[PDB]
Design a protein around this ligand. Structure first.
Ligand SMILES: CS(=O)(=O)N1CCc2c(-c3cnc(N)nc3)nc(N3CCOCC3)nc21
Length: 839
């Protein structure tokens, strides 16, 4: 209890919010949830193999893609084992288990004490009953032309990551009145309260008060009787209360049915959220914690025709953004049992239920009992994600989604993780199938767990609307990850807290860069190192990598908007095969939550291309948003911007020259072996970024924001606020790019023919998952793009994907998007140089 009192304070500094401070609660839902998450936590902590949890092999069941077999000559792989400068390369079959590889080294090449293969310089192990081809690090080594180096050392002790012991009346609501301490608005106004009964973005019923003058205190004492009956209220229905003046000024919500299935009784004083200027924050059950500046509100509570089948199939086959008319919904419902045979159709089918009708909901639940086909069908994440978005508030409907997620291997959980955590924002209750799912998979696997921690912590630090809910989920996870990880997270938290201070301090001291600031960093960073900064820590975007000491020599305040710090660290693992530093950018000013979502979709796309045996060489570098307009950014080594390569020859301003990029490429490559591979890396990376950026609607960029490695890998950066008559481009395929591919004006070459053909395989590969990208894009805007003015913004994604327009016209459409880039030349790019200078 005295020892347990301190532990909670340790949990609190890890979490970033105190899950016991009950100043901002009007019921016990959070505590009920903190209490409810004890079973699933203990049930997973007790269920996980201690060894395989401790070493956490990162593996996959997916086939080794075509492009990685072609890299394997004569069906063998070259493992380079190490020990104490005793290297020895070994030929190994792709299907060889790691235990059966130590058998080749120890038992052959020259009771027992069992050891394991760790990757040199990394907390990454090659253990467990998996073929060597199926470990991702191995695949990573193949894809980038690297060589698999490993140390033969002892397993980590499973003891280190153990845990501490533990009526038919019409519904009515009385609006007493509203209360703001200071009415800021300049002129006099009038105001009314709007009370909506909502279920999953549908307003079932609506009342309004009479308008009264806008004063610091405004009382009504009016009963608002609704059309809906108490019997007819579905679990997860919200009382959404809103203040208007015609303009929405304030909102707050309250679950009419609580977490014990009780109707909500009694007096409530709800502190409300103010409105800037839809958005996941609109939907929160959380009240505003700021009890001194926030508007308050006070209330009190108490077989068919072919024509129709074809009409049904044409509806089931439409994208998720295609609306349903009244006519469509009545068909889906009337033929619900025929609709139940088509998983593709569940989202539209469940959007056709009248949730405000107790008898229909009953019929919907018996209908959910006969879901044999849904269960057997192969997991579609696109379809699954869709039943977990803002349009579905029924927990049983959502359960089926999370059910299908149970099938995911860790590797895939990692792809969709970021947006699964964000999807918790659409849960009506703090305790849900999804929140528990995230908890289990986090507890089951340290890699999932690592990123769960940071994704949750990301939101806890910058969302008043959802911090509490996520805090309960993070706490739950932290209480089962073990002492070791608690130790890593604490170390990592200390570092980023330590380094955020410097980032903000340095920013204050300069509105170009000064000599006094450059030494200020030198000194301040020289200080932190002395003894306060931990010895080493996990890099939060690459948890297998442990940063050690700072390379103060290499650190500087960057000469760019918002004065980010360019920091570099020596690796803390001596078995690392280099003295090459770990580069991190620390920035305040940009909303790096947006970058996270965008980079994670890029990773999603690379995975969609692996399915169709494509590899478009994206470099979605690490990004972790750690607070409000603040976070870190991985440094991709050996890279420079396209704008600066132009500026290295042409100069600080002028006409951009087409020859420069190809000279820069050739000037860096040492041979006709590398350069011509570098050119092949460019053709591919350029295509990928051209396609990905086009579909995401962020293809029109200043080439100061496009980069290239000294090996041909092209990649974009800085993705915040890019989603906002003037000239436009679909993507950046400028004449300098084409020059590398061997074309000029409206000409053509073999490398450009490969470009054109790569883009088309890419663009059609993404169109194969139209729905998936639509859901992920729609969710991204609601949960992470503030300034989400309209759903119209979402409809960009369907246009770009050319929904309902055959494979072949789609080949054409995208070929002509390229042709617009060839026509526009340097002009749009010339306008950005102007724009980023012509204030
Ligand atoms: C070209 S630079 O002068 O070195 N510079 C200026 C800004 C910047 C960024 C960056 C990334 N994201 C965001 N939001 N802001 C800046 N990111 C990066 N990198 C990120 C990828 O690795 C290469 C370096 N470099 C930046």
């Amino acid at each position: 209890s005295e020892e347990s009192q301190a532990f909670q304070r340790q949990l609190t500094a890890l979490i970033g919010y105190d899950v016991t401070d009950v100043s901002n609660v009007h019921d016990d839902e959070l505590e009920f949830t903190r209490r409810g998450l004890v079973t699933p936590r203990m049930a997973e902590v007790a269920s996980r193999d201690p060894k395989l949890y401790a070493m956490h092999p990162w593996v996959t069941s997916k086939p080794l893609p075509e492009y990685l077999w072609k890299k394997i000559a004569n069906n063998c792989i070259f493992i380079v084992i190490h020990r104490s400068t005793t290297s020895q390369t070994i030929k190994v079959s792709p299907d060889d288990t790691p235990g059966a590889i130590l058998q080749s080294f120890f038992t052959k090449m020259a009771s027992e004490q069992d050891f394991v293969l760790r990757v040199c310089g990394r907390d990454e192990y090659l253990v467990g009953e998996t073929p060597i081809k199926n470990f991702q690090w191995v695949r990573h080594c193949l894809k980038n032309g690297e060589e698999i180096h490993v140390v033969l050392d002892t397993p980590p002790d499973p003891a280190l990551d153990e845990v501490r012991k533990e009526c038919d009346r019409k519904f009515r609501v009385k609006i007493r009145g509203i209360d703001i301490p200071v009415l800021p608005r300049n002129t006099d106004l009038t105001v009314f309260v709007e009370a909506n009964i909502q279920h999953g973005q549908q307003v079932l019923c609506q009342r309004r008060t009479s308008p009264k003058p806008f004063t610091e205190e405004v009382l009504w004492n009016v009963w608002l009787e609704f059309s809906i009956k108490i019997k007819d209220l579905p679990k997860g229905a919200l009382l959404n209360l809103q203040i208007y003046c015609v303009q929405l000024l304030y909102y707050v919500n309250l679950l009419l049915i609580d977490h014990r299935f009780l109707l909500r009784r009694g007096e409530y004083v709800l502190h409300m959220w103010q409105i800037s200027g839809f958005n996941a924050d609109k939907l929160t059950s959380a009240t505003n914690p700021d009890k001194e500046n926030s508007m308050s509100i006070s209330i009190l509570l108490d077989e068919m025709p072919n024509q129709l089948r074809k009409q049904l199939e044409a509806i089931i086959a439409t994208d998720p953004l295609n609306p349903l008319t009244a006519e469509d919904k009545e068909l889906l419902w009337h033929f619900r049992y025929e609709s139940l045979k088509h998983p593709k159709a569940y989202p539209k089918l469940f959007s056709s239920v009248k949730w405000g009708q107790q008898e229909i909901v009953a019929k919907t639940y018996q209908l959910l009992a006969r879901r044999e086909v849904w269960d057997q069908s192969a997991l579609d994440v696109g379809l699954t994600m869709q039943l977990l978005d803002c349009n579905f508030s029924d927990e049983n409907v959502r359960a089926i989604a999370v059910q299908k997620l149970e099938s995911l291997e860790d590797d895939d959980v990692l792809h969709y993780l970021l947006q699964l955590v964000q999807a918790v924002k659409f849960e009506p209750y703090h305790d849900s199938a999804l929140a528990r799912f995230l908890l289990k998979r986090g507890l089951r696997n340290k890699r999932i767990g690592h990123f769960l921690f940071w994704f949750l912590r990301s939101e806890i630090a910058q969302s008043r609307h959802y911090q509490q809910r996520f805090a309960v989920i993070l706490e739950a996870y932290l209480r089962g990850c073990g002492t070791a990880m608690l130790h890593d997270f604490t170390q990592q938290v200390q570092v980023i807290e330590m380094l955020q201070k410097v980032t903000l301090d340095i920013k204050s001291l300069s509105a170009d860069v000064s000599s006094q600031v450059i030494s200020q960093l030198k000194q301040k960073l020289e200080n932190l190192q002395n003894s306060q900064l931990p010895e080493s820590f996990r890099v939060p975007y690459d948890p297998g990598l442990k940063a050690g000491a700072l390379a103060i020599e290499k650190c500087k305040v960057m000469a760019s908007k918002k004065k980010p710090l360019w920091l570099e660290f020596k690796c803390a693992d001596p078995t690392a095969l280099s003295n090459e530093t770990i580069g991190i950018i620390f920035k305040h000013g940009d909303d790096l939550r947006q970058d996270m979502l965008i980079l994670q979709i890029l990773r999603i796309m690379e995975s969609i291309w692996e399915t169709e045996s494509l590899d478009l060489c994206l470099l979605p570098y690490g990004c972790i948003s750690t607070g409000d307009k603040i976070g870190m950014i991985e440094i991709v080594k050996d890279a420079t911007t396209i704008a600066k390569i132009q500026q290295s020859t042409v100069g600080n301003t002028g006409a951009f020259k087409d020859e420069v990029l190809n000279h820069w490429l050739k000037e860096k490559s040492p041979t006709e072996e590398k350069f011509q591979a570098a050119v092949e890396r460019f053709v591919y990376s350029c295509a990928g970024y051209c396609v990905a950026t086009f579909v995401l609607g962020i293809g029109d960029r200043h080439n100061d924001n496009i980069m290239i490695t000294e090996t041909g890998n092209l990649f974009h950066i800085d993705f915040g606020h890019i989603l906002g008559n003037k000239e436009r481009v679909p993507f950046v395929l400028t004449p300098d790019f084409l020059f590398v591919m061997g074309t000029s004006g409206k000409k053509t070459s073999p490398h450009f023919q490969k470009f054109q053909d790569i883009c088309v395989k890419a663009y059609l590969a993404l169109r194969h998952h139209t729905n998936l990208l639509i859901i992920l894009f729609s969710m991204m805007l609601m949960t992470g793009m503030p300034q989400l003015t309209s759903k119209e913004d979402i409809e960009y994604i369907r246009d770009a994907l050319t929904v309902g327009k055959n494979e072949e016209d789609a080949k054409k459409y995208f070929l002509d998007q390229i042709e617009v880039c060839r026509d526009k030349g340097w002009t749009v790019q010339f306008n950005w140089f102007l724009h980023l200078v012509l204030g």
